[PDB]
Design brief:
The structure is cut from a larger assembly and holds nine protein chains of nine kinds.
Chain A (H helix, E strand, L loop, with lengths): L11 E4 L7 H7 L8 E3 L4 H7 L5 H17 L1
Antiparallel strand pairs in A: 1-2
Chain E lengths: L5 E2 L4 H8 L10 H9 L3 E2 L5 E2 L13 H26 L4 H6 L3 H9 L4 H9 L17
Antiparallel strand pairs in E: 1-2, 2-3
Helix pairs in contact in E: 1-2, 3-5
Chain I lengths: L1 H9 L2 H22 L9
Classes of the chains: A mainly alpha, B mainly alpha, C mainly beta, D alpha+beta, E mainly alpha, F mainly alpha, G mainly alpha, H alpha+beta, I mainly alpha.
The complex binds chlorophyll A (CLA) (4 copies), beta-carotene (2 copies), phylloquinone and iron/sulfur cluster (2 copies).
One beta-carotene (BCR) binds next to helix 7 and helix 9 of chain F.
Chain lengths: 74, 31, 61, 135, 141, 742, 30, 80, 43
Amino acid sequence: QWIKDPLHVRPIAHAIWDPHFGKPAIEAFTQAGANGPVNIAYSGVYHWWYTIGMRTNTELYTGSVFLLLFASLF
Amino acid sequence: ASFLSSIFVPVIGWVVPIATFSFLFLYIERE
Amino acid sequence: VQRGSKVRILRPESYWFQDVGTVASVDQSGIKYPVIVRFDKVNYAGINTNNFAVDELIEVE
Amino acid sequence: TLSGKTPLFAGSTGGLLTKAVEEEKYAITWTSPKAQVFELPTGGAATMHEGENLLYIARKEYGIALGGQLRKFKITNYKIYRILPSGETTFIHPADGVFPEKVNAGREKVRFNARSIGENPNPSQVKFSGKATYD
Amino acid sequence: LGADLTPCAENPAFQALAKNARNTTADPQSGQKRFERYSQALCGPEGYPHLIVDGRLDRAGDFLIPSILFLYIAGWIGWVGRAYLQAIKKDSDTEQKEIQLDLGIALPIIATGFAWPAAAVKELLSGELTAKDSEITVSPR
Amino acid sequence: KKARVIVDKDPVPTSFEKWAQPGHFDRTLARGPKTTTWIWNLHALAHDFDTHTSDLEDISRKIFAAHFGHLAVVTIWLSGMIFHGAKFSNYEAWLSDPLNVRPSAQVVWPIVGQDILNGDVGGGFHGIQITSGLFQVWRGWGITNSFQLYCTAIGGLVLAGLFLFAGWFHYHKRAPKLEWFQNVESMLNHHLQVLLGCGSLGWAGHLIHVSAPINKLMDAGVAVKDIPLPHEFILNKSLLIDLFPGFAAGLTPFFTLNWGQYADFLTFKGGLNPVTGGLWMTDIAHHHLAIAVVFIIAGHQYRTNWGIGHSIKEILENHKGPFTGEGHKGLYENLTTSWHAQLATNLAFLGSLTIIIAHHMYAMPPYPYLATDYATQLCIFTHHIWIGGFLIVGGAAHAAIFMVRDYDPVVNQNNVLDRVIRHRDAIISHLNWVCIFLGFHSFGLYIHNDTMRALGRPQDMFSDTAIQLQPVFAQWVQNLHTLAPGGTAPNALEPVSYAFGGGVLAVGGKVAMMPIALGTADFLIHHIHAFTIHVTVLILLKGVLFARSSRLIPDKANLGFRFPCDGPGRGGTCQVSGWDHVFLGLFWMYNSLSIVIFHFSWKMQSDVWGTVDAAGNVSHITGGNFAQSAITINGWLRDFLWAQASQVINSYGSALSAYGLMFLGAHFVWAFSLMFLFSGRGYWQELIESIVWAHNKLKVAPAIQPRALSITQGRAVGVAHYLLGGIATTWAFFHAHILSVG
Amino acid sequence: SISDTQVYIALVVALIPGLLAWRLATELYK
Amino acid sequence: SHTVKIYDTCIGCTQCVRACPTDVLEMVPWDGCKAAQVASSPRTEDCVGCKRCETACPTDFLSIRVYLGAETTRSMGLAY
Amino acid sequence: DQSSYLIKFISTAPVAATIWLTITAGILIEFNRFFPDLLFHPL
Ligand code: CLA
Ligand code: CLA
Ligand code: CLA
Ligand code: CLA
Ligand SMILES: CC1=C(/C=C/C(C)=C/C=C/C(C)=C/C=C/C=C(C)/C=C/C=C(C)/C=C/C2=C(C)CCCC2(C)C)C(C)(C)CCC1
Ligand SMILES: CC1=C(/C=C/C(C)=C/C=C/C(C)=C\C=C\C=C(C)\C=C\C=C(C)\C=C\C2=C(C)CCCC2(C)C)C(C)(C)CCC1
Ligand SMILES: CC1=C(C/C=C(\C)CCC[C@H](C)CCC[C@H](C)CCCC(C)C)C(=O)c2ccccc2C1=O
Ligand code: SF4
Ligand code: SF4
C-alpha cells in the first residue's frame, strides 16, 4: 500500500496485541489503513527497502527467511 | 494467522519469564 | 646530605616527587630510609615530613 | 569455659540474630572494679557488675568497640572469644595475651613486602598469572 | 557579510524597532540614541545588530577592539595576581598573606600592572616565566 | 535553689585583634591555612560553639549574645520592610482602593533597561508588586499614612540598635553565669506571662483601642483623611462610643464580671467581615484578650522563688507507666545540660507550628483584603510551609547532634529515650513498611490511573466518576465544623472557616473563601502527603536513632555527627552519619512540601478562588479541572505544570520578565547541584592536580594548596544548590502565574 | 499480506537458528 | 577476604594497629626502622576493608595497603 | 594598636574582595548609567 503513495501512507512497524487495551485505545491505534491496532514505523526501513528494489511482501518475506538461514550459518 | 499473537504474546509474557526465572533461580541457588 | 641541606625528591609515589624539602635529620644507623625531610607544603593527609633513602634525594643547595 | 554474669539492662533489638545460632557468635569477658553504666555496642545503657561480666555479641567489631569503651573505664583485662555452633569457644583477642599495638617477641611478620609501594610490578607483567601486583 | 545582512539604517525591521525603542536609563532619549548608534552595524532580517568577528577592520569595533581592551585588562589582573604570589613566597608567613592581603606589597604591584605586556615579554625572553618540568611535581606514569 | 540575676563583669575584653585573626575560635584553625579546606572549615565551624570551648557557661554566653545579634538583623529587616513601605510604596493609594490597586513597595533604578520591572501596579505608582502581605498587615495595624510607617521604621532601627548593644553588653560587659541560664522554670514563667501573655494583652489593647475603630470606619467607606488619628479615639471618647456603644459602660463591667456589656467590641462572630473578607477585628480583639488571660494563668505553673508552682523535673519523673520503665526520668537533665536538645525540640515544634500557621491563615484570612489578594494568599502559605519544613529538618539534625555529642548513658538508663534506642530496629522496620505501604497505595493509584486513562479505560480509574475513594472522615469533620455555629458552638454566628462549609463569601467580584469540597483527588493527594511525611520521618528518625551506633558501625558516636563514611569496607559505609540522614531528609522534605504547595496552588485555583457573577455563580481560575486532572501524573504535568507555566515563560518584555529570568536561573542552579551530588571528591582532586601543574609551570601555584571540597561539603553544596534551585523555580513559577491570573 | 502457510514455514525455519543458538550458548558456557 | 600488605617504608608508629576496629593488625619485632617494630596483618579474615589503618598511616606514600578481595560474612560486616 | 587590627580585617580576603568588587561593580554600573547600550566600539 505504501509503495503506491509513499508521501501520504504511514508505514506500519508491527501489529499491537495487548490485552490491557480498552476499545477507545484499540480505535486510537487502528491507523494507516490497518484492520487492527498497529505501530507506525519511524526506522525508515520501508524507504530503504523500496529504494533497493523490493516491491512485494513476498520479497520482504524471502529476505527474512534468508536472514534466518544466514544467522543460522554464523 | 493473526491468532498466533494470542498464543505467542502470552508465552513471551508469562511462560518464558516463569520458565527462565524458575531455571535461573534454581541455577544460582545450586550448591 | 646532612641537616639543613635542601633536597629534591626522586620517589615517584611521593606527594613531593620533584619538590624541594629541607633535611631535618639523617639517622646514623642501618635503616633503609634514614633521611627525615620536612616540606613547606602539606600532603593530602596533612603531614609535611617523610623518611627517604639517600638514593631518592638530590642535594640542590 | 566463659565465666561472668550478663550485665543488667543488656536487652535490645540490636542483639544476636539467627547468625549467632547458625554461623558464629562472639563473647567479651571483663572484670570491673565497680558496678557502672556503659553504652552497649548496638545501643542501650547497660550496667556492668563488680567482678566478671560476660556479654554475647554478633560481630568481633562489637567486642573491639566495647573494648575501646572499657579502656575509657580504666579496664584492659577484656577477652573476646569466637563461639561456633558446635560450642567450640576460641580465645581470639588479645591473640597472645599482649595487645597488638604493644610489640611482643614470638610474633612473625605476615603479608610484609620488602619494597616501597612504588616498586610493585605493573598489572600487564602479572597478566594471565595466578599472582597479583601486591604479592 | 552573509545570511540576509543589510546596514541597520536600510533594514525596515530596524526602523520599526527604533520607533518603539525602550529607554535603557533615566535619559528619555536613551532608547533613540541606542538605535542611532546601532544604525552603523549590520542587521539581520528581524532588525537586530549582527556582529562580524573575522578581523574585518571596518567591523573592528564589533570584536577586535573589545578583544584588545579585554586582553589588556585580563592580562593586568593575571600579572598583578602572579606578581603578588611571587612577592609573598619570599616572606615567612606566605599562607597568611594569601587570605590576609599585605596592601604594602599588593598596591604597588596593582599600580605597576599597566606595563604587564613589557614585563611578560621580558620574563618570557629571560626563562623567568616558566619553571623546569623536572622541578615541578607530577603523578607516577 | 532561688532564681536570681548572677553575671560575671567584663568577661571578654572588646578589641579588633581577633577580627584580624581568622579562625581564632578553633585551636586547629588558629595555626592558619595550609590548604583551601581551611577556608571552608572556618565558615563551617564558625557558629559551632561546642567545638570552640568545652565550658557550658562560655557556650551559653556565646548563644545568648548571638541571639541579640539575630534579633538585631531581623529588626533591621522588619524596619527596612516598613521603611520601604513608608518611602517606596503605593500603600496610601492602596488604602483608598484595596480591590483595584496592586501592593508594591520595591522601586527599581533605571539602569541597563531593568526599569521594565517597575510595572503599572495602580495608584499612579510604578514598582515591583509585593506578595509578602505587608499592606494587609499595616491595614490590620490601623496604619493610615506614610508618617506612621516612618515612626515605626525609626522605632525599629532604635530597637535593632538596642538589640546589638544588648548582645555586646551581655557578652563583653555583663555575661550571665550558667546558674542564670538553667532557671528553665523562671524562663518559662516570664516567656509565657510577659513575652506571650502580656504581648497578647498589649496587642488586645491596640486592637480594641486603635485597629478595630480605624478598620470599622474604613469598612464603612470613610475616606482615609476623614478617619481620626488613633490617639483621637482615646482623647475623644465620643468617636469610639459611636462605633462601639459598649465603651459607654467604662471599665466597671470588667471588674464586676458584667462582661456582656463589651459584647459589641469583644465578639465571637466567626466567618469573615463581608466588606474586607478578613476575620472580624472584634473577634481578633477577644481572641488576643482570651489568649493573654490563658497565658498569664499558664505562666504561674512553674516554681521560682516562693515554693508554690511545679518543678518540671518532678512532673517528668512522675510520668512513668508499665510500658516505659523509668518514663521521662533523666529528660530534664538532657534538656537543661544540652543546648542541642533544646534547639532540636524548639526547631521541631516551631517548624510544626509554622505549617499550622500556613493552613490557619489561608482558611481564616486574618487581615483585611488578604483573602482576595490571591498572590499574597498563595505566597504566604508556600513561604510558611517552606520555613516550617526546614525548621522541622533542623529539629531532627540537632536531635542527632545531641545523640552523638550530649547524650549520657548514666542519665538516660531505662527512660523513654533509652527504651526507644533498644527497639529502634522495631521502630524503623515498621516505619519502613508503612512508607512502602503508603507509597504503593498512594502513588501506585496515580500510576494505575495514568495507565487506565492511557489504555482508554476511564471506567477502571480511581476517580469520582469511576472507582471512588471518598475521604468520608474529612467529609464528616467538615460537616461537624459547618453545623458547629448554633450547635456545639452556640455563641458562634458563622463557622470558624468557610472552607469547612456555609456559603461562598465574595469581596469585590472575587471569592474570599468558599467550602473546599473533598473527593477522590483530595483522598489521593492527602495519602501522598502522609506518604512523603512518613518517608521524611523514616530518614530523619533513622538518622537520630542510629547516630551513635548501628549493626554496621558499632562506634559511630566516636566518628562523630558529621563524617563522610567509614570507608568502602563492610560492602561500603557511605552516608551512615546522622549528618548524612539530614542531607537525605532535606531532599524528601523538599519532595514532600513541593507536593503540598502544588496541592494548595491547584486545589485553591480550581475549587475555591475565582470571580462571582451578580446571580452568585462562581467561575474558578482553572474551572474545577482538579477533580478529573489531579488523579493522574499526566494531569499534573499538563493541567498544572505545563498549563500554569505559560505566564512565567511568556514574561519577557514585561514587568514579570524578572520571574522568567529567576525561573531559568533557578532551573540552572538546580541542574548545577547534580554535578556535586552525582560526582565524588576523588575525580575533582585529580583534575585540580593537573590545573595546579599548569599554575606551577607558570609559577602562579598558590601557597594555600587547592583541594577539592570535602566529601561532606560536596553533599552540603549539592543539597544547598538543589533546594535553592528547586524552591526558587517554584517561587518564580508561583509569582508569574498568580500575579497574572490571581 | 503473506499467507498463513508462509508464516508457519518462517516459524519452522526459525527453529533452526533457535537450535543452533542453544548449541552455541551451551558450547560458549564450557 | 581482603588482603592487607605492609611495605618496608613502615616507621612502626603503631597508629594502623590502634585504628583497626577488628584487630587484624599487630606490631612485630623488626630491625628496618628506628622504632624497631613493623605492622603485620595476621588476621586478614577479620578485615572489613574500612581502610582506617591507611587513614592512620603517616608515611608518604602509605606503608599499609588494603586490597579489597572476595567478600565474606566477616568482610561484609554482617551481624546476620 | 586598634587601627592596625581594622586595616588587617579590611585586607582579609572576603572584606577586601567585597570592597574591590563593590568598586568594580560601581565603576561598571556608573559607566553604563552615563554611556548605556554599548554593544560595540563605534567607528
Ligand atoms: C506480557 C504479557 C502480558 C499479557 C498477555 C497479560 C494479560 C492480561 N493481563 Mg496483564 N500484566 C502484565 C503482563 C501481561 N498481562 C504485567 C507485566 C503486569 C504488571 C505491570 C500486568 C498487570 C495486570 C493487572 C493488575 C491485571 C492484568 C490483567 C490481564 C488480563 C486482562 C484481560 C481481561 O480483562 O480478561 C480477564 C482475564 C482473566 C480474569 C484471566 C484469564 C486466565 C488467566 C490469564 C490464567 C488462567 C490459568 C492458566 C491457564 C495457568 C496459570 C497462569 C500462568 C502460569 C499462565 C490479561 C489476561 C487483569 C486481570 O484480569 O488479571 C487476572 C488485571 O487485573 N495484568
Ligand atoms: C593570579 C591569579 C591567577 C593566574 C595568573 C591564573 C592563571 C591561569 N589559570 Mg588559574 N585560577 C586562579 C587564579 C589564577 N590563575 C584562582 C583563584 C582559581 C580558583 C577559581 C583558578 C582556577 C583555575 C582553573 C580551574 C583553571 C585555571 C587555569 C589557569 C591558566 C589558564 C587561564 C585560565 O583558565 O583562567 C581561569 C580563571 C579563573 C578560573 C578565574 C580566576 C579568578 C580571579 C579573577 C583570579 C584571582 C585574582 C586575585 C584574587 C588577584 C589578587 C592580586 C592582588 C593580591 C595583588 C592560567 C595559567 C586553567 C588551566 O589550567 O590552563 C592550562 C584551568 O583549567 N585556573
Ligand atoms: C535557630 C536555628 C538554628 C541554629 C541556632 C542552628 C545552629 C547550628 N547548626 Mg543547625 N540547622 C538548622 C537550624 C539552626 N541551626 C536547620 C533549619 C537545619 C536544616 C537545614 C539545620 C541543619 C544543621 C546541620 C546538617 C548542621 C547544623 C549545625 C549547626 C551548628 C553549626 C552551624 C554553623 O557553623 O553554620 C555555618 C554556616 C554556613 C556553613 C553557611 C550556611 C549557608 C546555607 C547552607 C545556605 C544559605 C542560602 C540562603 C538561604 C539563600 C542565599 C543564597 C545566596 C547567598 C546565593 C550550630 C550549633 C552543624 C553542626 O555540626 O552542629 C554541631 C551541622 O553539621 N545544623
Ligand atoms: C521518582 C523517583 C524516585 C522513586 C520512584 C523512589 C522510590 C523510593 N524511594 Mg527514593 N529517592 C529518590 C527518588 C525516588 N525514589 C531521590 C532522588 C533520592 C535522593 C534524595 C531518594 C532517596 C531515598 C531515601 C533516603 C529513601 C528513599 C525511599 C524510597 C522508597 C520508599 C518506599 C515506597 O514508596 O515504595 C513503593 C514503591 C514506589 C512508590 C515506586 C513505584 C511503584 C510502582 C508504581 C508499583 C510497581 C509496578 C510494577 C509491579 C513494577 C514491576 C513489574 C515489571 C518488572 C514487569 C521507594 C522505593 C525510602 C525507603 O526505602 O523507605 C521504605 C527511603 O528511606 N529514597
Ligand atoms: C510594631 C513595631 C514596633 C512597635 C511596637 C510597639 C509600639 C509596642 C508597644 C507595646 C505596648 C504598648 C504594650 C503594653 C502592654 C501592657 C500590658 C501587658 C499591661 C498589663 C497590665 C496588667 C496585667 C494589669 C493588671 C492589673 C492592675 C495593674 C491593677 C488592677 C488589676 C489588674 C489585674 C487589671 C517597633 C517600634 C518596636 C518596631 C518594630 C515593629
Ligand atoms: C586574529 C583573530 C582571530 C583569530 C585568532 C586566533 C586563531 C588566535 C590564536 C592564538 C593562539 C594559538 C595562541 C596560543 C598561545 C599559546 C600559549 C602557550 C600561551 C601562553 C600564555 C601565557 C603563558 C600567559 C601568561 C600570563 C600573562 C601573559 C598575563 C596574565 C598572567 C599569565 C601568567 C596567565 C579571531 C577570528 C578569533 C577574531 C578576529 C581576529
Ligand atoms: C565541581 C565539584 C568540585 C570542584 C569545586 C571546587 C573545588 C569549588 C571551588 C569553587 C570556588 C568558588 C573557588 C573560589 C576561589 C577564589 C576564592 C575566588 C577568588 C576570586 C573572587 C574574589 C572573584 C569538588 O571539589 C567536589 C567535591 C566533592 C563532591 C563533588 C564535587 C564537585 O562536584
Ligand atoms: S565512596 Fe566516598 S563516601 Fe563512599 S566509602 Fe568511598 S570515600 Fe567513603
Ligand atoms: S603501617 Fe603506617 S601506621 Fe602502621 S605502624 Fe607502619 S607507619 Fe605506622
